[PDB]
Amino acid sequence: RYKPDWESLREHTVPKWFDKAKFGIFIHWGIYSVPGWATPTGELGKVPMDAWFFQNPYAEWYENSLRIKESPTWEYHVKTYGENFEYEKFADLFTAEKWDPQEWADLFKKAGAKYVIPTTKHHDGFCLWGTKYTDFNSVKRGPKRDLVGDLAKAVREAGLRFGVYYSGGLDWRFTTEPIRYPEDLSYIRPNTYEYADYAYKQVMELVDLYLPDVLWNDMGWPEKGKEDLKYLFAYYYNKHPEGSVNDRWGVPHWDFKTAEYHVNYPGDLPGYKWEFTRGIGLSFGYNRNEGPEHMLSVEQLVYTLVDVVSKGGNLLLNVGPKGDGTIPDLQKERLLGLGEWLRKYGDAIYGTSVWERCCAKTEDGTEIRFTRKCNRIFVIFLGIPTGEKIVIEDLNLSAGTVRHFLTGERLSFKNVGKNLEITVPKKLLETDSITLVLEAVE
């Protein structure tokens, strides 16, 4: 068994299934989904942090924004709901009237996801399972239902892995003051031993009820509770060796690291397993304010996934459901576009490993990414070059054979100096969908 200590826990590494899966779906869903509103200011890492909490683009941060008087959210709220309308009242209006978990699971599978991870409890402290440690949960209020449980059953019946997200670092049911600046995060926290217990008992409870494939913590773990993780991790791994944990615990152990929008995003092979997460738009929770101008297009999604995968990561794309449980059309379409692309090109993504280098580019600026499967090297262009003559810069191959992936057609190539030159018959070029893919066999 694993013993409750970091040295011993280090014996557990990211499970194969996770490394091989490449793509998963995040779901930020909660009472904040009811107001479903945020100012779509921009991407995390590009918006100045002296303004960010005041024009927060993360709609799941509604309550914190509402607590900042005279922030767009406050004005919005008072004009739509009134001032005698507390945030907590949304728990009663969160009825998931149209929710159908098998439909969600069907959709995420058509999209190409191999795992799914919903918010079991986000910063507002509202719980989506019938926890026995708080009455502010979905069985007692709103949906009158075990959202986490019913979704885990549907995902698993679809053949996908199921994880859980928990806001261990923050819980607004234990604070009153909102976060206005990044600095506040250092003192405006539950801070109590009672909260460290609560968080431990709630994650232990999710382990016992659903034995998730992934424990996805957010915002660090209560300082008073960090030592508890030795036991929790050992407890978790002894019941599920193929389980995994991310790196937002702030303790020595983790199975894979994370990056959010621009933050900690690698420019090259990082050297450890990681996972990229972002909303389809600029928010994780649903935002009725976002239009397609705020979202990635299917093409960008595809390019995002390939960049991630070529660097050894997994993409954890977030979908933001409505309070009624339906998935906005703008999101469903992109999930589908991506699913379409994975059906054609998935063999150069799932099950691959990184190669000597992640990246290259054609003489004209088209970006290229590589993935590998034993002796097979996939060459994925971010786009489809117009001309049959492709000049790839600073690359030489020793393969001897280079095929056009989709058709399997052997192609003509030769190293011309510091470059590699290939000729792709326009008939084939016109065959690819968003990316020209080639396969080199060494």
Ligand X SMILES: C[C@@H]1N[C@H](CNC(=O)c2cc3ccccc3[nH]2)[C@@H](O)[C@H](O)[C@@H]1O
Residues in contact with its own copies by CB under 8 A are 1, 3-4, 6-7, 10-13, 176-177, 181, 183-184, 186-189, 191-194, 196-197, 200-201, 208, 224, 228, 230-231, 234-235, 238-239, 241, 247, 250-254, 257, 270-272, 374-375
Binding string, residues 329-368; x marks residues near ligand X by CB under 6 A? ----------------------------------------
329 binds, among ligand X, its own copies, none (CB under 5 to 8 A by kind): none
Name the residue nearer to its own copies (CB basis): 147 or 199. Answer: 199
CB of 238 to its own copies, least distance (A): 8
Name the residue nearer to ligand X (CB basis): 219 or 422. Answer: 219
d(CA 396, CA 418): 7
DSSP string of 111-143, one letter each residue:
TT-SEEEEEEE-TT--BSS--SS-SSBTTTSTT
Q: Among 202, 185, 184, which residue's Cα sits nearest to residue 194?
A: 202
Name the residue nearer to its own copies (CB basis): 275 or 432. Answer: 275
d(CA 21, CA 272): 16
Name the residue nearer to ligand X (CB basis): 28 or 334. Answer: 28
Q: Verify binding: residue 311, ligand X, rule CB under 6 A.
A: no
Name the residue nearer to its own copies (CB basis): 241 or 291. Answer: 241
Residue pair 369/380 in contact (Cβ under 8 Å)? The answer is yes
Exposure of 43 in the CB half-sphere (CA atoms within 13 A): 17
Considering only residues 19, 63, 260, 290, which one is a binding residue for ligand X as defined by CB under 6 A?
A: 260
d(CA 281, CA 267): 22
Reduce the DSSP state of residue 104 to 3 states and report it: helix
* Stretch of residues binding ligand X (CB under 6 A), selected from 74-82, 187-195, 259-267, 352-360: 259-267
CB of 316 to ligand X, least distance (A): 8
277 binds, among its own copies, ligand X, none (CB under 5 to 8 A by kind): ligand X
CB-count exposure of residue 432 (10 Å: 0-12, 13-18, 19+): buried
H-helix or E-strand containing 344? helix 329-345
Q: Verify binding: residue 65, ligand X, rule CB under 6 A.
A: no
Q: Verify binding: residue 134, ligand X, rule CB under 6 A.
A: no
Contacts of 255 (CB under 8 A, 6+ apart): 12, 13, 14, 15, 18, 244, 245, 246, 273
Name the residue nearer to ligand X (CB basis): 202 or 277. Answer: 277
Total residues interacting with ligand X, rule: CB under 6 A: 14
Name the residue nearer to ligand X (CB basis): 317 or 380. Answer: 317
Residue pair 250/189 in contact (Cβ under 8 Å)? The answer is no
431 binds, among its own copies, ligand X, none (CB under 5 to 8 A by kind): none
Name the residue nearer to its own copies (CB basis): 17 or 181. Answer: 181
251 binds, among its own copies, ligand X, none (CB under 5 to 8 A by kind): its own copies
d(CA 130, CA 352): 39
CB of 311 to its own copies, least distance (A): 14
Name the residue nearer to ligand X (CB basis): 316 or 338. Answer: 316
Q: Verify binding: residue 60, ligand X, rule CB under 6 A.
A: yes
CB of 336 to ligand X, least distance (A): 23
CB of 53 to ligand X, least distance (A): 10
Binding string, residues 238-257; x marks residues near ligand X by CB under 6 A? ----------x---------
d(CA 398, CA 394): 14
Q: Which residue matches tokens 């997200």?
A: 165
Considering only residues 39, 277, 289, 352, which one is a binding residue for ligand X as defined by CB under 6 A?
A: 277
Residue pair 109/101 in contact (Cβ under 8 Å)? The answer is no
Residue pair 135/127 in contact (Cβ under 8 Å)? The answer is no
Exposure of 23 in the CB half-sphere (CA atoms within 13 A): 26
Q: Verify binding: residue 73, ligand X, rule CB under 6 A.
A: no
| CA dist 154 → 109, 212, 213, 299, 441 (Å) | 11, 13, 15, 29, 40
The interface with ligand X within residues 23-42 (CB under 6 A) comprises 28
275 binds, among its own copies, ligand X, none (CB under 5 to 8 A by kind): none
Residue pair 238/209 in contact (Cβ under 8 Å)? The answer is no
- For residue 125, is it left (φ>0), alpha (ψ between -120 and 50) or beta? left
Q: Which residues bind ligand X (CB under 6 A)?
A: 28, 58, 60-61, 218-219, 248, 258-260, 263-264, 277, 284
